[PDB]
Design a protein around this ligand. Sequence first.
Ligand code: ICS
Ligand code: CLF
Ligand code: CLF
Ligand SMILES: [Fe+3]
Ligand SMILES: [Fe+3]
Lengths: 477, 477, 522, 522
Amino acid sequence: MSREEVESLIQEVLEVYPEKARKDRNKHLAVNDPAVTQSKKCIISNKKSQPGLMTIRGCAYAGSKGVVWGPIKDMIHISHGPVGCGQYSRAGRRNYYIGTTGVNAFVTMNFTSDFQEKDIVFGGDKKLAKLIDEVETLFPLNKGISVQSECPIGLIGDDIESVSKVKGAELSKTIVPVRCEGFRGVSQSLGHHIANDAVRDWVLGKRDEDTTFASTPYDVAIIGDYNIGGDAWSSRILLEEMGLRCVAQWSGDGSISEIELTPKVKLNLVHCYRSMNYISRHMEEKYGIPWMEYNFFGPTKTIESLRAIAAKFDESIQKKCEEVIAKYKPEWEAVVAKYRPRLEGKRVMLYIGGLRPRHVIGAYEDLGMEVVGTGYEFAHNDDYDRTMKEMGDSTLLYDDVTGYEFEEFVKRIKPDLIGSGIKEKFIFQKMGIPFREMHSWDYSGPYHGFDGFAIFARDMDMTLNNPCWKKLQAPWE
Amino acid sequence: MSREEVESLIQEVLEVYPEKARKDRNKHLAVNDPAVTQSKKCIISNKKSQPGLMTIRGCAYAGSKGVVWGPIKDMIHISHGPVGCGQYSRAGRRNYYIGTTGVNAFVTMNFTSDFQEKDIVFGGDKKLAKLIDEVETLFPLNKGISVQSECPIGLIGDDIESVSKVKGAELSKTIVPVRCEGFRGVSQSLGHHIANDAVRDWVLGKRDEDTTFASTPYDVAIIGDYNIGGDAWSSRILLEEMGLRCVAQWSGDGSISEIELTPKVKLNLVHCYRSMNYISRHMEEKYGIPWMEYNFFGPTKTIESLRAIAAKFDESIQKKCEEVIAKYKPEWEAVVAKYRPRLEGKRVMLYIGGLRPRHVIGAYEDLGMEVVGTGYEFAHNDDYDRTMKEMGDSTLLYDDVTGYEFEEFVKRIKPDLIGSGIKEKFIFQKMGIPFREMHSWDYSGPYHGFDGFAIFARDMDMTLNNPCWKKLQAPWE
Amino acid sequence: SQQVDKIKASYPLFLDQDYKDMLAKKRDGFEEKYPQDKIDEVFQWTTTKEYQELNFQREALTVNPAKACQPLGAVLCALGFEKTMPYVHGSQGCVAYFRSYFNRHFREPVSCVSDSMTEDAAVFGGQQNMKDGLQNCKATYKPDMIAVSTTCMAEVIGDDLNAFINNSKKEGFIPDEFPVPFAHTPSFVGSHVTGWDNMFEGIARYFTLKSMDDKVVGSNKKINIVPGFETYLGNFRVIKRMLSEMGVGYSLLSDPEEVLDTPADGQFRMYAGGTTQEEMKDAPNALNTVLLQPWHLEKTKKFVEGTWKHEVPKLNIPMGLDWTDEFLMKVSEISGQPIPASLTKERGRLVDMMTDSHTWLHGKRFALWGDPDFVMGLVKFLLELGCEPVHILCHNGNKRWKKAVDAILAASPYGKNATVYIGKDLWHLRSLVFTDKPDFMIGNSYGKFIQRDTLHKGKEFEVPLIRIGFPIFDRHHLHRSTTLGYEGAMQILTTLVNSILERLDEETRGMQATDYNHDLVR
Amino acid sequence: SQQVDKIKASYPLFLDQDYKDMLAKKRDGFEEKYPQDKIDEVFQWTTTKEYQELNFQREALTVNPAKACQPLGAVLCALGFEKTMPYVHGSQGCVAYFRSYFNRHFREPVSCVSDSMTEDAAVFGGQQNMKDGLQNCKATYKPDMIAVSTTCMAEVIGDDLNAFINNSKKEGFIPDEFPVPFAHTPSFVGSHVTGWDNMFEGIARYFTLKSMDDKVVGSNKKINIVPGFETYLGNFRVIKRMLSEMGVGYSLLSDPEEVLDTPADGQFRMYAGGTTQEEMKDAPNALNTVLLQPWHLEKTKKFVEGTWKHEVPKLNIPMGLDWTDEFLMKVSEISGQPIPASLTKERGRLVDMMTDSHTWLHGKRFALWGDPDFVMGLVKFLLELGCEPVHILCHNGNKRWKKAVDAILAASPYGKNATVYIGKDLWHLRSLVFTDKPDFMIGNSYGKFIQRDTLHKGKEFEVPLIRIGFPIFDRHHLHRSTTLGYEGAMQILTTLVNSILERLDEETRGMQATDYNHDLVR
Ligand code: ICS
Ligand code: CLF
Ligand code: CLF
Ligand SMILES: [Fe+3]
Ligand SMILES: [Fe+3]
């Protein structure tokens, strides 16, 4: 509580900044009010980062190559440019898949054009064509090539679209040029937008004239779930026992054929609204497929989501949904009975990219834990409108928080647990506050659905109640 | 080399001893003369060691349990007494075998009575009977029990023979009591004798009245080969290619049934004379089975031994022996052509137990290496009779050599290679001299036969010519 | 389904029958997967020699490289100075990736800032970005120094760092006396070690170029040590310990071991230790300068020999036995300090372990990859142990380095089967280990996938990986190890012999099949 | 048949078709082997709970013990003194076995002599043996001191060591001023640690009992350190280093670290380092005496308290964070020296490693065995890490130690599923790990066989072994490791976490089967 104290803390943290930096950062820190439904009057998001402030945001290449296009397993993705970008993003995100790597799957592989000085001076279109020829020679079982651009590609004037068109016509292949240069935009959000535009323009409409796919009234697509530690599989199994047929899965463990078959489904189940709203709206306007969001974080949210999804179909799906809920109830009741006494009353602070800070709240509350602070790296204002109603009164909200700002906020609030990325993990560990990686699930998971709730509760208990947090002060100090 | 210098060196080494120790040790060092046939006039062996002089000799328990009885795989061997002996002798000898350990094979397993103070005061016969009952309960697939005595068993008034007789009558199981206490004798040779006597008294005559085993004129038994590193196997295949049938091998990879079937063979091929001449002579007197010695160390000795064995049979076996020699000639010829230039002209000293100091000389000479010094831990005078004709002019011979003696001899002679046990290995390795373990083959092998000669040559080359021997002196000194 | 008493993570929860059936249904219905026999045929073809000729004909496609870009090394070099903030002029995604990489390797916080350059700076340049970034960084994190590097963005648009910083100081965004060394680090040139060299040269030029009038060589009775790109704290520690035992005055320039090994006691330290500005200003007064990794410190060597007038010795990396001896004798000659008995005893102990384990090391075949100096030192040490390198790979090597490595190999009979590859990636190495199978691989974590592929061909074709190098992501606290000196040689020797013995134990664990060779004593 | 280019040792030479046919012919012809179905049935029976109930009913049979006899520990204690010759009164086979054991564990020369007592001494005694042995050893090997222990033969016969040595000195076999301490070490009492305690008490009584009139406690401002039976050189080194950093005067008694780590420089050093006779004579003048392993130093504690008038602190082994902290605080209180900042930083770094690895280490189940002090220290460390000790076994433990370890387990929530066994051997532990499967085993090389057995039941039933303890025969240079203090805690933590990660990597290497969890970053 103590909204006045929260505002005073915000002011005290903000004093250190210069005039322009202070004025800019004042609009991105706010005190929550659930009665407020317009976050635009409360917080400002999706703006440029102040220079030299140790930001956490990535680039559009990370949003496009690392998030959207990367999990597609039967496609080869070329990091067009110098060596660093594909090397730092190689196998860094745990988007799980089934396949033979190097033969028919290429997710954890790093294909790059390896730009040198001559490529910068004279261009890399000829090198790109030769690279495409060599890719086709060495990897015959690939089902498509996407070329993800880095900053020099956009800065030197390379016509990747023409090369992609000529090579695709020559080899009868789908080659997708993505102009995801890192200097475009302010964060990964523009990368998501550009990747969705590329999917719409080059892949989505490849079977408009094709009608050889048999369609059923219970055909659904999973949108925005990237199978982090098997999350998409854990959601898909629940959808399957409910009687539905999951045709496509974007994009974790996804294939180009599933993307092309998506316009044939009857309903879109959007997991990440932030990174896939563009394509879901395009599908709704073009093919007339309705889309709806679902939350599978914790038993309550997944019961509500399952019932909402089953309401979109006839009575048989509703009976199957009730049967699934009845079947899975004892398991999560046992999980709650085991792990609620050890986690009741704890306070949580969160800072994740664009969807989880508001999705994981229900999962945290089902274990008797309260969230006192949250924030986003690149979320838009609609995400904040969705989040503000799901938080308690006078809780802290931070957009594009800096290292110093989050440091001081955590110092003052003193939560029992913090969820953020790898760049805050060791900092908060050295503070002595338990930390959970909310991007990679700390190399654990899945956390979606009933099967993921048990893992989530076990991880929460094992990190919060670990003895190492009690051993930071030497006994002679 | 230079007989007078060798005698002078012997005198300088003896100079440091006290008068009694010096007088005793004067009789155990000699300068070899191949013309001399009887070693009693030059060297003295099989005598008690001088106290406090760091002998390498073991005990009778080591020579009985660790050498003769241990390799028997389907028997369980109890170490009657305190816990140390079986612990130090467990899996220290590389007698290879085929079987399921803990179910039907027990070579690497340590069985002991674990004597306490109360067992010392009040005996251990009742404990022995209870232990035999427990062994019968927990290891039903064992095919016999041996009870190897340690020092307190013979020191206190224990009577294991009566216990073994009663338990064998009760359980219809073969139980062999071995009075192999440590303080008997002066070394492992008395352990060999005691173990052979136990074999003769309790096991060998079990199938005297049984005539259900079909016999052929080509039945041979390997005696004294303990399958070190697979050595016995590397010999047996050759015997099988000659057309002979090997009914038993004593005792590496050996079974009690093979021991009982031994009195049915036509020939006894004795490898280790020292440890099994007793049983070979007993079988010659009782069953009339002839025995001959053979040597499979190096191509020359192997060929000569194969020809000598074949001459004991009909012409078909001789023809098969010629075919085997012709088949294996190119392989050992290639091994020589590859490794002799790297090992030509090198000088080596050996200190091993009862057989190998003279058995491996031919294999070294096949590679162009000269043996300049040799010695035994527990050999008798007949072993030295064989060695003197086996060895060269003015070479050094030592019996029960001490650590000080061996170090001084090695310092004066400066050999290129030393072959001895684990207790001199690191002593000579720190001295800057290549060292090969001639008991366990340095955890390599086998060294018998044509296939073992290649491994032998490779090991000698790899140790003699290692770069690490040229790096022992710091460049700044 | 999950049992409360035994909860299953992703492995092996998805090996359950329901998940397996779901995955099979998905594959058979909507993935249009190739037939399994076709996949097996293609894998077999990729394991063949013809695929190796097709792979080595590549000219424009790079698959699984073994190098990074220059600003990463520039950041690592900047981290080694006291209260110094690494500042990369360009896009923030690069800094995010650098921080993630170093956090995953060192498992420690890594501090770095960017000026967040965007399309507006892509059109008009990043002068305002530089001014505001310098002001904000100094006001927020209070550093004593800001070390500036560049990304490919600013390099392509041709931003002038010197003019930008001069304008920032002139207009009052940052104080004139505030140290802001800078370096141009084009990522399309060289690799991260080149960036380290460029940043170190920039810092040295900033602190010494204009004040060389009063400098006398050998005046402070110290020896300058330039380590280069290094990711083992044990290497810094062993160098410092060896120099302290000899009683030799030294100045370790760019020393990051304190800031990468901070304790956990309830407080956060953005800065810890590092080379002071006094050391950097007094460096020209040293007797000489020693470069630990000369094959990527060429610009530093040119600056030191030309400006500081130090006769830098021709020393290899102090790795193994012979090169450590040469380094110690050169240091003793330069400083006039005799080598103590402790170092002699340590060398004797290393020789003793070499003598003990020579039997197991002899004849073993290794693939290896990494940075040039590390690779050549590893090759030298493996030659000293009697091991046989056959495939030597260095993605960021050049022709002179290859000539030096060939000269090293020709001097030993164990280098007769070795081939050196420069400009080849890990797909080439996968093809090489398939066509000419070695016993072991030595390299960073990226080699693990290669091992997986080998296991797909068969257990007899599997090539185990030994994790020595950078980056190691799948093991904990391996960055605390040492590769330099006698102690590093002992650690490497222990690791290699133990890898051999674990492989032998695994291959002979079959009961009644291969367990006849499962020896208790090895 | 052999190929000269690729020569095969026993493995895999004996896997050839001809050797396989030869072995099969031998087995079906002359071995009279049981049918394979019967062997499989008996193995499956031995893996069951009924077999465990039968196995725990054993009262007379010991199968695969985890301890040695007293004279081995007596020899190890005697090796820790300067120019001291271990001399065992009894039979020579015991000395041969002791030397082989220590040679295999340490890979170093081990010196020990015996009087070679034979059947003649069984009725006359070993008095002449003692005289001749003392004279010969002094004449030949030139020791400054001879430390005498006994074998079971001499104990059963009843040889009076004191009378024998006095008569040897009286008749001129050795000088009267030559130090010859002695101890009775019956092998049927206790184990090797008991022998170490007996030998140390004998040496202390020889050098201090009769000259206590001029001894004043605290005169030399030192603290005596008694390490006990130790086979890690790193433990001696780390204790010395930690006490040196505190600036604390200390006297390590029975330090064999130098004699077990002699350099290989072209000469053989029979003696190296060790506690001097002056230190042992001055020991009663110390401030206090600290016993690092108090659970096998009871006789030493009694002698030090009752004779030296030293108030021996009640301290556990300095294993793990809490016990290391307690040891450091007790040393600081005794010596009046503040704990330095370097040790605080090292403690913080260990805490940081714990924080980094806690997710992988939490909830893991361990079977474990060893010596009492080592076992309880490792149990305490595992409890501190959030791990779950399950099967705690100590063949040489007693009931009081059992009560203490149960008290330690009850104080932690992670000890709920922990059971402690004393007097049980490794066949008992094999049954335990079959019936109640843990995740890993911790122990000496003798556990490898157990692992093999588990692999025979199935891959999902295999329990990997972690080699921490004595003796280690199948790995090289592991005796150089550290298990005491923060350094030892970090080494043990690294070993455990990397064993877990390597097991996970092995379990997820199957292509298109389990490699979805083959993560690059762990
Ligand atoms: S795509 Fe986005 S940062 Fe929606 S870029 Fe990021 S696998 Fe986060 S909060 Mo990493 S908008 Fe997914 C995300 Fe959320 S990589 Fe994952 S966890 S739900
Ligand atoms: S914002 Fe994004 S990650 Fe940055 S470059 Fe731009 S697309 Fe890429 Fe790869 S190579 Fe290195 S890290 Fe950059 S500086 Fe040249
Ligand atoms: S000469 Fe031989 S090995 Fe020696 S005891 Fe005697 S039979 Fe045995 Fe086992 S227990 Fe220890 S080692 Fe001895 S002293 Fe008592
Ligand atoms: Fe850390
Ligand atoms: Fe050694």
